[PDB]
Design a protein around this ligand. Structure first.
Ligand SMILES: [Mg+2]
Ligand SMILES: [Mg+2]
Ligand SMILES: [Mg+2]
Ligand SMILES: [Mg+2]
Ligand SMILES: [Mg+2]
Ligand SMILES: [Mg+2]
Ligand SMILES: [Mg+2]
Ligand SMILES: [Mg+2]
Ligand SMILES: [Mg+2]
Ligand SMILES: [Mg+2]
Ligand SMILES: [Mg+2]
Ligand SMILES: [Mg+2]
Ligand SMILES: [Mg+2]
Ligand SMILES: [Mg+2]
Ligand SMILES: [Mg+2]
Ligand SMILES: [Mg+2]
Ligand SMILES: [Mg+2]
Ligand SMILES: [Mg+2]
Ligand SMILES: [Mg+2]
Ligand SMILES: [Mg+2]
Ligand SMILES: [Mg+2]
Ligand SMILES: [Mg+2]
Ligand SMILES: [Mg+2]
Ligand SMILES: [Mg+2]
Ligand SMILES: [Mg+2]
Ligand SMILES: [Mg+2]
Ligand SMILES: [Mg+2]
Ligand SMILES: [Mg+2]
Ligand SMILES: [Mg+2]
Ligand SMILES: [Mg+2]
Ligand SMILES: [Mg+2]
Ligand SMILES: [Mg+2]
Ligand SMILES: [Mg+2]
Ligand SMILES: [Mg+2]
Ligand SMILES: [Mg+2]
Ligand SMILES: [Mg+2]
Ligand SMILES: [Mg+2]
Ligand SMILES: [Zn+2]
Lengths: 60, 83, 155, 23, 97, 116, 127, 97
RNA sequence: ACCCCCGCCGUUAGUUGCCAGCGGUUCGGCCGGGCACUCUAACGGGACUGCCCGCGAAAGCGGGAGGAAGGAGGGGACGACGUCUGGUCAGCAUGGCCCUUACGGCCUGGGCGACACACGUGCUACAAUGCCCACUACAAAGCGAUGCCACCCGGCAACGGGGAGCUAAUCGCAAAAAGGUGGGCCCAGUUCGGAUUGGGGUCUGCAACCCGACCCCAUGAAGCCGGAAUCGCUAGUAAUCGCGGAUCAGC
């Protein structure tokens, strides 16, 4: 259950609650950031490549 | 529980079936998937077959059992004890 | 730790008596960092050891200290195949530290109901030479004496 | 008692409001 | 009579305020200096590895620093040549009055 | 056996003393003392017989207490167990009734441990 | 007419306004003692002027914002100490060996990932 | 008391009990076996019996590998014994001088 | 070492932030007025064992001064060749092996929440340095346009109905709590403790039987400081008190 699942997510639901965030990049059901459309692994990956604007490693 | 401002709840696809049996007079095996459903004074005397996950459980209904939901009398877990 | 010896932390003299010793003794009454509560109680107690015994709380305090400062103590040190109770003199630093600890501790072992009272009383009895604090002190010194024997095993 | 829902101290903890802690 | 500056990069939010400061002070008349507004910080924390390893995360942030300028006594000799203004990519501009 | 079937702690405040009745807590305590006009701080030891008759009267005739309360709860569960609902199934098996975890803990309804 | 120093402590900052007078003191339009009522820590918020014979000779109008009742106290101690040294630069010695002339940078150390606070590690078990 | 994990394998209460019985060999020493832990696993190579036990003077950590699971379970024990025996008697070695 | 935060200072910057002095002051920095100060967020400065003395072949070490900071200033970011045939084919990518009206796909329902037991992490406690009601203060970092919601009202309350402000240094979440003045409890399984249960309501939600959080009445358990064993922490740390955020309809 993968592409079949990421697909069921894309489409509009039979009820309003069943809105669940998938990663747009890998399809991950869990730990998905609204602000990016990404799960935390993907999140970390692009930010590392640099393909995430303003996003840098925080040191404090 | 479920808010009082909203309406005491039945699935519609059951409520009609309940009452289709009021016209002709009871009583049928009502196989159901509706544990979600309250028991209603219009349900008394009936024997609705409640689905627990595996089985449609034969359940008789009475006076004392009105406020509760449909899933209470088709319990879901089998447990004869430990060892 | 391993390398150089640690430095004695310097206390900010208290805003009533300006006594370095007094500061420490409060913080020993201090629980959960709630210092003011503890500060209250010390002073509360002085209120009591002034009325209940008519002269300087302060003076009574430093006497309860000199009377609970243990002079020799034992420090366990295995020689061969037995753990020996080895007699040693307590560093000046440590006489304080201990004498503080035991004072408060002895106190909380008492039946009068407010902490404010006990710290007074214990500090009262111990100032003369009585008191459950001194009982700990007295004991620590007998342990030393009795074991005068094993004192060339001092380091 | 930081867990007794029925007190001032309690509704602070459980992060709520009620009779024992109104707004 | 005022402009507002929102972007992710600061060498640019400062450089662009700086130039609009220079645009309307040259071109008449009064400009209330580029004011450094407090940055709103969107932070991200994330477990470093893909599976288990709970206590080794990586720390990410998204600085969105703010900037405000005022061109005080307006004088549309300025208000003209601001439609002729050179703005970098990583900054968005806001004007009201 | 005074009010309302239980002899309340004397030498205590009436408001807390009244809590020592089965069916009366901090809430109903404030309530009868307003509605019969008694200082919460007066000691049970010091109650006017008049205040006794005021206090006792309001309390016994307004709230279900002691024995009749217990039989209600009892028969409330009696049904709940006889009717055959999951709410009652746990009652019959000594188990917990509020959807809590029973793999670990669950010790107050179960009771100090039964080893294998 | 006036003397100023800036006092800081943790996230607390103290604005001190000295004006020679009966020696009286105010914090945010509120009386000194009224503001720190029941905090024994207080009387050494006014401390550095005692290091220079100045208790009653100056008044104090004081603003303070941020931090807590005590770091605030501390910053005041810095701020009043600051101002007496502008007013009177021959006041270096007789305030600096008392350390008043400095600002302890001891702030909250950061909560770190994998720990429970700054330093309290989580409890583990070999067996 | 005593715990056993069967990692990515299915095992029986028989097999479990035998393992209880095997660790008993350690009981000899008459020190406390505190929360002993056995983990049984299958490598490609054969099985693996892990063990980690705290006793008042230290811990036992061991690993037996063998084509036979039971043999692996014993080798586990042989190593544990050794450790424990050294744990109980390394003290006495230096009594004099 | 070069990067970030905090610590001191200067430059630039003055609203939505600041208010020292004048004027009003509708009694709200509310307005005039100003950027002093506070701050804000950018740019530099500064500390280098440089100076002094001594010990030193030297590197360095001991110590005093000046300074906000002194010997690595406190914290962070950063982790060598490699090790554990360490972890992940269930994030993903992927060789190969395997399924093909099914080992794929859709849905309702159940399960992932089971409970004789054992272990790990933790919350709240066992109380008077304490518990409760009242009244009175002082943070910071964040979030907030089917969002945060002032304030008005019905409500014991959860909440509900109205309804203003804010793309937010303005408007809101917001109360910070410990703490402070006061009053009750008077050593009791209690005014400790808040589990368990009965009953009545609120909200989210197509739906809270399984299985949601919340309020109120009632119930008011175990528990009197914990065996063997054993964890953390060297300073703004440990301890203790509250606050936000992510994910999220709710939890
Ligand atoms: Mg895939
Ligand atoms: Mg959802
Ligand atoms: Mg998701
Ligand atoms: Mg003792
Ligand atoms: Mg209570
Ligand atoms: Mg507590
Ligand atoms: Mg963890
Ligand atoms: Mg009661
Ligand atoms: Mg539950
Ligand atoms: Mg359960
Ligand atoms: Mg700052
Ligand atoms: Mg005071
Ligand atoms: Mg902290
Ligand atoms: Mg291993
Ligand atoms: Mg050997
Ligand atoms: Mg300036
Ligand atoms: Mg050196
Ligand atoms: Mg480095
Ligand atoms: Mg492997
Ligand atoms: Mg895969
Ligand atoms: Mg594959
Ligand atoms: Mg399904
Ligand atoms: Mg389910
Ligand atoms: Mg699970
Ligand atoms: Mg926990
Ligand atoms: Mg009881
Ligand atoms: Mg009680
Ligand atoms: Mg549910
Ligand atoms: Mg008991
Ligand atoms: Mg007791
Ligand atoms: Mg303990
Ligand atoms: Mg404790
Ligand atoms: Mg022990
Ligand atoms: Mg260390
Ligand atoms: Mg919180
Ligand atoms: Mg949130
Ligand atoms: Mg949420
Ligand atoms: Zn992803």
């Amino acid at each position: 259950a993968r592409k079949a699942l990421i697909e069921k997510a894309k489409r509009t639901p039979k009820f309003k609650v069943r809105a669940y965030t998938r990663c747009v990049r890998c399809g991950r059901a869990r730990s998905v950031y609204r602000f990016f459309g990404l799960c935390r692994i993907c999140l970390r990956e692009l930010a590392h490549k640099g393909q995430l604007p303003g996003v840098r490693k925080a040191s404090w | 529980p479920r808010s009082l401002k909203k309406g005491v709840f039945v699935d519609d696809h059951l409520l009609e079936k309940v009452l289709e049996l009021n016209a002709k007079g009871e009583k049928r095996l009502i196989k159901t998937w509706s544990r979600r459903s309250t028991i209603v004074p219009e349900m008394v005397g009936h024997t609705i077959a409640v689905y627990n996950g595996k089985q449609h459980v034969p359940v008789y209904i009475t006076e004392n059992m009105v406020g509760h939901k449909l899933g209470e009398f088709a319990p879901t877990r089998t447990y004869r004890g430990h060892g | 730790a391993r390398r150089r010896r640690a430095e004695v932390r310097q206390l900010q003299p208290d805003l009533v008596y300006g006594d370095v010793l007094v500061t420490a003794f409060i913080n020993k009454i201090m629980r959960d960092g709630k210092k003011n509560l503890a500060a209250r109680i010390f002073y509360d107690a002085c209120k009591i050891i002034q009325e209940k015994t008519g002269q300087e709380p302060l003076k009574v305090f430093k006497q309860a200290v000199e009377n609970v400062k243990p002079r020799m103590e034992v420090r366990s040190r295995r020689v061969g195949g037995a753990n020996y109770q080895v007699p040693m003199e307590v560093s000046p630093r440590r006489q304080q530290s201990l004498a503080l600890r035991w004072l408060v501790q002895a106190a909380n072992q008492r039946p009068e109901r407010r902490a404010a009272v006990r710290i007074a009383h214990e500090l009262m009895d111990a100032a003369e030479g009585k008191g459950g604090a001194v009982k700990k002190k007295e004991d620590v010194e007998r342990m030393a004496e009795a074991n005068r024997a094993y004192a060339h095993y001092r380091w | 008692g930081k867990g007794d829902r029925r007190t001032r101290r309690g509704k602070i903890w459980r992060g709520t409001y009620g009779k024992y802690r109104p707004r | 009579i005022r402009i507002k500056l929102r972007g992710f990069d600061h060498k640019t939010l400062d450089a662009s305020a700086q130039k609009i400061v220079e645009a309307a002070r040259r071109s008449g008349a009064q400009v209330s200096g580029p004011i450094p507004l407090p940055t709103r910080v969107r932070r991200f924390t994330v477990i470093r590895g893909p599976f288990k390893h709970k206590d080794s995360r990586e720390h990410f942030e998204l600085r969105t620093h703010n900037r405000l300028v005022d061109i005080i006594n307006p004088n549309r000799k300025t208000i003209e040549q601001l439609m002729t203004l050179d703005l970098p990519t990583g900054v968005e501009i806001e004007i009201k009055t | 056996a005074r009010i309302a079937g239980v002899e309340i702690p004397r030498n205590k405040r009436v408001d807390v003393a009244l809590t020592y009745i089965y069916g009366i807590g901090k809430a109903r305590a404030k309530e009868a003392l307003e509605k019969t006009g008694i200082n919460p701080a007066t000691r049970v030891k010091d109650l006017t017989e008049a205040e006794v008759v005021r206090l006792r009267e309001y309390v016994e005739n307004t709230w279900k207490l002691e024995g009749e309360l217990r039989a209600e709860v009892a028969a409330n569960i009696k049904r709940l167990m006889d009717i055959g609902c999951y709410r009652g199934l746990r009652h019959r098996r000594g188990l917990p009734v509020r959807g809590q975890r029973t793999r670990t803990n669950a010790r107050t309804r179960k009771g100090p441990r039964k080893t294998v | 007419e006036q003397y100023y120093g800036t006092g800081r402590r943790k996230e607390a900052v103290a604005r001190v306004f000295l004006r020679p007078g009966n020696g009286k003191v105010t914090v945010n339009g509120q009386d000194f003692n009224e503001y720190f009522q029941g905090l024994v820590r207080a009387v050494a918020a006014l401390e550095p002027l005692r290091a220079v014979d100045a208790l009653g000779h100056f008044d104090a109008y004081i603003t303070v914002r941020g931090g807590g009742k005590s770091g605030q106290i501390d910053a005041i101690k810095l701020g009043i100490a600051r101002a007496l040294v502008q007013y009177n630069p021959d006041y270096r010695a007789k305030l600096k060996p008392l350390g008043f002339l400095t600002r302890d940078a001891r702030v909250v150390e950061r909560k770190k990932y994998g720990k429970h606070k700054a330093r309290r590690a989580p409890q583990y078990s070999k067996r | 008391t005593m715990n056993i994990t069967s990692k990515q394998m299915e095992i029986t209460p028989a097999i479990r009990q035998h393992v209880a019985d095997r660790l008993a060999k350690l009981e000899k020493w008459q020190t406390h076996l505190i929360n002993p832990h056995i983990i049984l696993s299958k490598e490609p190579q054969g099985f693996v019996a892990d063990a980690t036990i705290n006793t008042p003077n230290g811990v036992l950590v061991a690993s037996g590998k063998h084509e036979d699971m039971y043999t692996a379970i014993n080798e586990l024990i042989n190593k544990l014994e050794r450790q424990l025996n050294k744990l109980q008697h390394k003290g006495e070695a230096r009594r004099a001088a």
